Design an enzyme around this catalytic site. Structure first.
Site, mmCIF file in Angstrom:
data_model
loop_
_atom_site.group_PDB
_atom_site.id
_atom_site.type_symbol
_atom_site.label_atom_id
_atom_site.label_comp_id
_atom_site.label_asym_id
_atom_site.label_seq_id
_atom_site.Cartn_x
_atom_site.Cartn_y
_atom_site.Cartn_z
ATOM 1 N N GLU A 1 0.649 -1.280 0.057
ATOM 2 C CA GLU A 1 0.078 -0.058 0.100
ATOM 3 C C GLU A 1 1.024 1.262 -0.031
ATOM 4 O O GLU A 1 0.952 1.988 1.012
ATOM 5 C CB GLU A 1 -1.058 0.044 1.242
ATOM 6 C CG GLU A 1 -1.990 -1.002 1.168
ATOM 7 C CD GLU A 1 -3.021 -0.981 2.125
ATOM 8 O OE1 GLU A 1 -2.985 -0.253 3.132
ATOM 9 O OE2 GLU A 1 -3.971 -1.681 1.816
ATOM 10 N N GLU B 1 -5.321 -8.474 0.802
ATOM 11 C CA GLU B 1 -6.382 -8.003 1.858
ATOM 12 C C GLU B 1 -7.561 -7.923 1.660
ATOM 13 O O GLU B 1 -8.215 -7.055 0.604
ATOM 14 C CB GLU B 1 -5.864 -7.024 2.379
ATOM 15 C CG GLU B 1 -4.525 -6.873 3.403
ATOM 16 C CD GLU B 1 -4.039 -5.758 3.899
ATOM 17 O OE1 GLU B 1 -4.702 -5.178 4.448
ATOM 18 O OE2 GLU B 1 -2.571 -5.636 4.061
HETATM 19 O O1 GLC Z 1 -7.486 -1.757 8.463
HETATM 20 C C1 GLC Z 1 -6.279 -1.671 7.543
HETATM 21 C C2 GLC Z 1 -5.836 -2.964 7.369
HETATM 22 O O2 GLC Z 1 -5.835 -3.122 6.048
HETATM 23 C C3 GLC Z 1 -4.536 -2.036 5.427
HETATM 24 O O3 GLC Z 1 -4.909 -1.729 4.078
HETATM 25 C C4 GLC Z 1 -3.160 -2.612 5.895
HETATM 26 O O4 GLC Z 1 -2.653 -3.216 4.852
HETATM 27 C C5 GLC Z 1 -3.475 -3.641 7.083
HETATM 28 O O5 GLC Z 1 -2.242 -3.736 7.812
HETATM 29 C C6 GLC Z 1 -4.349 -2.949 8.019
HETATM 30 O O6 GLC Z 1 -4.539 -3.800 9.400
#
Ligand code: GLC
Ligand code: GLC
Lengths: 453, 456
Positions: free
Chosen positions: A173, A361
Site C-alpha cells: 500500500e 487483503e
Molecule cells: O485496516 C487496515 C488494514 O488494511 C490495511 O490496508 C493494511 O494493509 C493492514 O495492515 C491494516 O491492518
C-alpha cells in the site's frame, strides 16, 4: 443479501484457487527490543502522545515473535493453504543502512522453514510500514537515499529466503506510506506536506523498482509483486463536475502508483498540477519503476465515494468525501458495499496491462469477544461471503483472479486505532495471548479446506 | 554608543562573552561516530526549515575551531559560551559512549584554557539524538535518565577545566515551540506531549545538576532560560489577568518548579490532569539550588486576553508592537522590557547570580568594501548593554553578558537566511569577516577585566 452456504460458494471457485490469511510484522510480532531490533518510525509514532489511540504500541502485540509455531499450527488446523506475512526491516538491517542483523534473518528463516514443513505457502511482504527510525535522519522517504537502503535490504532478504519463498511483494500500500503518512499526517512519520509527500511518492515507486531488480538478481525463481489498496472511486452524482472529480481522484489516489509501475509514466493532469513540486525524476527512473511483475496484490475494504470540491484554491485533485450509500458499516465505521470490488477490478484491467491478481487483503472490523468459548461474529462472516461472491463473479467473467487472503489471521495492532479495532478471523485475548478461532474463522476454514481440489 | 563611557558603567570584573550552539555551527554531521539528531531529521523533511537548509556544512566549526578560538582571543573577549552535541557523545541517546566525540570537546576546552578563554558549556541546546524518539523523545521519562547519564559522562571528562555549565538552553523552545506549536524539532502540536516534555525537561535539569555536582563539585551549575517579558496590551482587568496567565504558562512552567519547587497553581488547575506522573521526589530534584542562571533576551512578549470559546490556557493572543523598530527577522526592538523583566523576576523569585547568556539582533547585511556595515546591530547592542548597566547600578546581581552569535550560523527554522553574528560568515568560502558591531564589541570587551591600576 449475502448467501454464505460454503459448499455452494466453494463450487464457484476453480480447483487450483489459493486461499490464505494475512498479517504484518509490527501489528503482531512484539519483541521490539530483542535479537538486535532497533526502533521503527511506528515505535516513535506510537510512543508520542496524540498519534495512536490509547498510546498503544507494538511492544507486546500478539507476541508472535515467540509464539509463531503455535500460529502456523493454527493455520494448519484451519486448512488454509497460504500465509501472507511481512518482514521487519528493523530486524534485518536495524539502522536501515549499515550492518546486517544475522539474528533478524534467522527468525524469518525459521518461520519460512516452519511453513514449508506444514505445506503452508509463503507470500512475503518486504515493506509493510515499519521503516527503521534512523533513516528519518536523512529525511526518510523524502530522501532518495532511502530507496537505495531498501534496495540493499531487499537483496539481503531474498538472498536468504529465495530458495523457499512461494512469492514476494516489495511494498504494501504505497497510498498509505505516501499520502496517509506524509500528506494527511495519520500514519507515521505523521507529516502533512505536499512536497514531502510527492518526494515519498516517487522514492517509494523507485524503491519498488530497485526491489524487483534485487529479487530477480538473487532469487529469479520467486514471482515478484506489489500490493496496492487501489481505491474504487465512485462519484457522488452523474453531474459533469462529479465525474471529472472522480477521474482526478483516480489519478491522484491510484494513478500516482499504477501508471508509473504499469505504464512507465505519471498521470498527465497530476503532473500539470503537482509536477513542479516533485523531486528530481532521473532518466532511468520510470523504466526501473515499470519493470514487468509476475503478479500483483489488491487490498480492498470499502468504496471511495467522492464529490467535487469547488472551494477556492483546493489542491489537486480537489474532491471531498461523499456520503455512504449502503446503511451497513463495520465497527471501524467503513461502509460495506461489495459491488465496488467488481467495478474496481474491471476498471483496472481496462486501464492497465496487469499480471495475475491476488486479493491480498479483504476483511472487516467487528469487535465481539469470547462468550461461551466461542466468538459470535456473524457480520464478519456475512462480509466474507458477500465479497468472496464478487471474487467468484470476477473469476467467471474471465479476470485472472488466482487467490484470496482474508485480512487478519488474528486480531492485532491496528495502527492509529491501537488494539481497539479487531479484524481477525481469530480472537486474541491480549492479557493471556490465548487464540480463539471466531465463527467467521470456522466458516473460512470450511471453505478453504476444500482447496486445492 | 561611546564604548569608553559605556565601559565605565561596568565593574572591573564584569564578564564579556560570545555565544554559540553545537548544531548551529559545527557541521561534520556524520563524522567521528556522530548519529543523527532530531534536528537533522527536522531539516531534511520538506516543510520544516526554510530552503530545506540543514546542518551538514554550517560554519564548518568542527574543522575550523582553533581558528575560531584564535578569533575570540584576538577580539579580546574573555568568555566563550558553546553547547556540547549529545549526538557526538552518546550517539543513540542511551547506548555506548563515543570517545572520539568526547575528545573533540576535551581538545576544544584545552584550546580555550591555553588561550585564556573562559568556558561556559551548555549540555543540551536542542540536538536530541534521534534514536531516543523511539521511546517518545521528551514525552518519555526515560529520556531524562538518558540525559542524566549523558550529563555525568560529559562533566567527568570536562569538569576539571570548565569554568561553568548550564544543563539546558531555553526549556520554553524545547518544550512549547517544539511540542505544542510545532515550529521546532520534533515538530509536535499536542498538549499532552508538550506537558510530558515540560515535566521531563525540568526533571532532566535536576538530574543534570546532581550528576554534575557528583563528578565535578567545583563547577558552578546553571540553567539558561528565555524568560519572557510579558507586557499586557492594556491595563484592563481582562488583559492583566491574561498577562499573568501568560507569565505562568510561558515562564512559571519552568521558573516555579526550579526556584519554588512547585508548578503554578492556576496552570495545574487547567492542565495538570493531562500531565505525566509527578513522582514523589520530582519537585525536590528539580528545585536543587543553582550557582547562577542565564537569561536570554531579545524582545518583549506582548499579549491580550482571548475570549474565544474553549481557548486553552493561558488563553491569550498576540498584541501589537509599541516601537516600530524591527530586526530583519521581524522582532520588535524594545530595550526597557529587559529592565522590567529582570526586576519582575527578582521580586517574584529567589534567584542566584545572573548572566545575560544571549542578547543580539538579526540583520542580514553582508560584505561590501571587505567590510560589513551593521549599524542597527551595533545600535541594538549599545542600547541593551545600557539597560544591563542600569540593572547593575540598581543593585541587581548581573555578573556578565554574552553576545548572541559570535558568527552568522544555522538559525533553526529560518535556515541560513537570518544572520545574528558579530562576525560575518560566507558559507561558500567559510571566510570569517568581523562586522562593524563586532569591532565595537571587541573594543568594549577588551578593556575587561579592567585590571589593577591607580585612580585620581
Ligand atoms: O485496516 C487496515 C488494514 O488494511 C490495511 O490496508 C493494511 O494493509 C493492514 O495492515 C491494516 O491492518
Ligand atoms: O533566534 C533565536 C536565537 O535565540 C535562541 O535564543 C537560541 O538559544 C539561539 O540558538 C537562537 O539562534
Amino acid at each position: 443479501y449475502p448467501m454464505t452456504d460454503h459448499k455452494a460458494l466453494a463450487a464457484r471457485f476453480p480447483g487450483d484457487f489459493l486461499f490464505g490469511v494475512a498479517t504484518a510484522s509490527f501489528q503482531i510480532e512484539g519483541a521490539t527490543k530483542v535479537d538486535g531490533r532497533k526502533p521503527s518510525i511506528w515505535d516513535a509514532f506510537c510512543n508520542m502522545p496524540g498519534h495512536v489511540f490509547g498510546r498503544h504500541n507494538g511492544d507486546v502485540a500478539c507476541d508472535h515473535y515467540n509464539r509463531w509455531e503455535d500460529d502456523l499450527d493454527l493455520i494448519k488446523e484451519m486448512g488454509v493453504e497460504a500465509y501472507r506475512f511481512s518482514i521487519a526491516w528493523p530486524r534485518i538491517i536495524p539502522d536501515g543502512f549499515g550492518p546486517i542483523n544475522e539474528k533478524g534473518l534467522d527468525f524469518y528463516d525459521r518461520l519460512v522453514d516452519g511453513c514449508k514443513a506444514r505445506g503452508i505457502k509463503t507470500y512475503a511482504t518486504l515493506y509493510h510500514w515499519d521503516l527503521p527510525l534512523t533513516l528519518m535522519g536523512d529525511g526518510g522517504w523524502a530522501s532518495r537515499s532511502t530507496a537505495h537502503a531498501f534496495q540493499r535490504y531487499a537483496k539481503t532478504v531474498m538472498a536468504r529466503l529465495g530458495d523457499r519463498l512461494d512469492a514476494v511483494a516489495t511494498f504494501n500500500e504505497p497510498w498509505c506510506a505516501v499520502w496517509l503518512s506524509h500528506l494527511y499526517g495519520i500514519h507515521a512519520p505523521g507529516e502533512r506536506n505536499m512536497e514531502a509527500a510527492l518526494a515519498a511518492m516517487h522514492h517509494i515507486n523507485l524503491a519498488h523498482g530497485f526491489g524487483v531488480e534485487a529479487s530477480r538478481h538473487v532469487a529469479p525463481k520467486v514471482p515478484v509483486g506489489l500490493v496496492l489498496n487501489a481505491h474504487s472511486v465512485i462519484p457522488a452524482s452523474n453531474s459533469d463536475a462529479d465525474m471529472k472529480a472522480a477521474e482526478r481522484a483516480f489519478q491522484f489516489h491510484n494513478g500516482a502508483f499504477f501508471d508509473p509501475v504499469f505504464k512507465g509514466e505519471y498521470p498527465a493532469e497530476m503532473i500539470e498540477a503537482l509536477g513542479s513540486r516533485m523531486p528530481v525524476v532521473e532518466a532511468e527512473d520510470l523504466s526501473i519503476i515499470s519493470q514487468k511483475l509476475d503478479w500483483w496484490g489488491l487490498n480492498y475494504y470499502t468504496p471511495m465515494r467522492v464529490a467535487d470540491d469547488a472551494t477556492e484554491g483546493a489542491e489537486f485533485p480537489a474532491t471531498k468525501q461523499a456520503p455512504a450509500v449502503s446503511d451497513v458499516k463495520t465497527d471501524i465505521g467503513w461502509e460495506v458495499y461489495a459491488p465496488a470490488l467488481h467495478s474496481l477490478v474491471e476498471t483496472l484491467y481496462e486501464r492497465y496491462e496487469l499480471p495475475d491478481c491476488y486479493i491480498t487483503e479483504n476483511g472487516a472490523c467487528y469487535n465481539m469477544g469470547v462468550e461461551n468459548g466461542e466468538v459470535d461474529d456473524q457480520p464478519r462472516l456475512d462480509y466474507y461471503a458477500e465479497h468472496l461472491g464478487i471474487v467468484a463473479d470476477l473469476v467467471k467473467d474471465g479476470y485472472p483472479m488466482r487467490g484470496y487472503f482474508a485480512w487478519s489471521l488474528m486480531d492485532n495492532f491496528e495502527w492509529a486505532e491501537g488494539y481497539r479495532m479487531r479484524f481477525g478471523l481469530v480472537h486474541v485475548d491480549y492479557e493471556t495471548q490465548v487464540r480463539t478461532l471466531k465463527n467467521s474463522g470456522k466458516w473460512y476454514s470450511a471453505l478453504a479446506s476444500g482447496f486445492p481440489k
